[PDB]
């Protein structure tokens, strides 16, 4: 009766947050976002996205690292796989492009746990933790992974974003503030045995 | 990049649901429930509860088995551990007392996965997927486990309950209908690779 995965957490003060050039969005609006999703679905099929959950603590209270675009939406680090790209190699690539260092030193990403799956049935905002009834051609499939951090690290944050550490209580039942994926992180993280180092 | 746990599901028509004598609640009201929780906290400390998630399919659509008390609340099979009782042996004991057969043949319970943890800070209904800030003496700790079923089985259901198979879409965003633990099962089950046998 020890069936929980054990995960090491380190203090937020163990991590250094530097800066680098802006990293711009591929779409300038919601309307362009859904147009490009339609164009690529017709050429290569369902969009495959991957996202990483990176956890720290302060004073033994766990916090998720989020990327805030100016003072607008909160995002997990991640993005779109290429056709035939492995999911885990692809999340490591995407996290190096977002938070990798100006001095070109390699981060050691450790990814060993899936923490969920979401499906977008139409070219519209709604997403579900299952394929809904009657839907045979979903337009996007997102996969979330727990990213185990090293004891210490330097991350370079694009100048147009803020890295923020959110406590779980702030996420919980806050879909209006964070949306349905980030707001359900407390439930999805409850199964881990965290060590507060 | 295959990090998901694989789980076999079988058709609901593979399972037989017989009947047996009523199984009565330990508390006759909400008021007696919170009185007994107070009395036992003073004698043996925090309540330790365990619950099982039992999954089937029909026509390749997953469903969770719930126990309905008359036409009132929906419950997971489970209940209260004794002082010093192992969590996994204790859930197997409790599920045999609820759904074990009138003819006294042994069910083969397989329990290999934790799917979450909830904490009750006071002698009151609110529960969280974390220990809230400032709380040092939580009054209850619930642990949920995924119960892998065999290809076929007979379950005896107490005459005062109905066994019902709920599709995930019915649970999703339905805390008013099911409460915060059962309503978040779709998110907590999204990480599994189900095989529809
Ligand atoms: C929310 C998206 O669908 C997937 N995640 C991302 O695109 N994440 C991201 C991208 C650029 C900078 C910072 C973060
Ligand atoms: C909801 C409770 O705190 C824990 N679970 C149960 O007590 N489950 C249960 C008990 C008796 C019959 C049927 C189901
Ligand atoms: Zn401290
Ligand atoms: Zn898919
Ligand atoms: Zn069928
Ligand atoms: Zn506890």
UniProtKB/Swiss-Prot annotation, chains A, B:
Result when mutating residue 130 to A: Abolishes interaction with CPSF6
GO biological process: cell differentiation; co-transcriptional mRNA 3'-end processing, cleavage and polyadenylation pathway; mRNA 3'-end processing; mRNA alternative polyadenylation; mRNA processing; positive regulation of pro-B cell differentiation; positive regulation of stem cell differentiation; post-transcriptional regulation of gene expression
Result of changing residue 51 to A: Reduces affinity for UGUA RNA by 12%
Keywords on record: Acetylation, Cytoplasm, Differentiation, Methylation, mRNA processing, Nucleus, Phosphoprotein, RNA-binding
Outcome of mutating residue 73 to W: Reduces affinity for UGUA RNA by over 90%
Outcome of substituting residue 25 to A: Reduces affinity for UGUA RNA by 88%
Consequence of changing residue 188 to R: Reduces interactions with CPSF6 and CPSF7 and decreases mRNA 3'-processing activity
GO terms for cellular component: centriolar satellite; centrosome; cytoplasm; mRNA cleavage and polyadenylation specificity factor complex; mRNA cleavage factor complex; nuclear body; nucleoplasm; nucleus
Stretches assigned to coiled coil: none
Chain positions of motif Nudix box: 79-100
Gene Ontology molecular function: chromatin binding; histone deacetylase binding; identical protein binding; mRNA 3'-UTR AU-rich region binding; mRNA binding; protein homodimerization activity; RNA binding
Positions where N6-acetyllysine occurs in the chain: 26
PROSITE patterns, alphabetized: NUDIX
Region (Interaction with RNA): 72-74
Site features described as Interaction with RNA, chain residue numbers: 25, 33
Function, in words: Component of the cleavage factor Im (CFIm) complex that functions as an activator of the pre-mRNA 3'-end cleavage and polyadenylation processing required for the maturation of pre-mRNA into functional mRNAs. CFIm contributes to the recruitment of multiprotein complexes on specific sequences on the pre-mRNA 3'-end, so called cleavage and polyadenylation signals (pA signals). Most pre-mRNAs contain multiple pA signals, resulting in alternative cleavage and polyadenylation (APA) producing mRNAs with variable 3'-end formation.
Cross-referenced PANTHER family: PRE-MRNA CLEAVAGE FACTOR IM, 25KD SUBUNIT (PTHR13047)
Protein name: Cleavage and polyadenylation specificity factor subunit 5
Organism of derivation: Homo sapiens (Human)
Gene name of the record: NUDT21
């Amino acid at each position: 009766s020890m069936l929980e995965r054990t995960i090491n957490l380190y203090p937020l003060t163990n991590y250094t947050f530097g800066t680098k050039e802006p990293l711009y969005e591929k779409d300038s609006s919601v309307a362009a976002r859904f147009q490009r999703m339609r164009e690529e679905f017709d050429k290569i099929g369902m969009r495959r996205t991957v996202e990483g959950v990176l956890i720290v603590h302060e004073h033994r209270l766990p916090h998720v690292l989020l990327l805030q675009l100016g003072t607008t939406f909160f995002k997990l680090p991640g993005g779109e796989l290429n056709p035939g790209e492995d999911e885990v190699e692809g999340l490591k690539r995407l996290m190096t492009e977002i938070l990798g260092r100006q001095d070109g030193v390699l981060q050691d990403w450790v990814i060993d746990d899936c923490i969920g799956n979401w499906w977008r049935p139409n070219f519209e905002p709604p997403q579900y933790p299952y394929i809904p009834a009657h839907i045979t051609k979903p337009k996007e499939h997102k996969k979330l992974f727990l990213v185990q951090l090293q004891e210490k690290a330097l991350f370079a944050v694009p100048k147009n974003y803020k890295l923020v550490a959110a406590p779980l209580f702030e996420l919980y039942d806050n879909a209006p503030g964070y949306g349905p994926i980030i707001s359900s992180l407390p439930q999805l993280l409850s199964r881990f045995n965290f060590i507060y180092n």
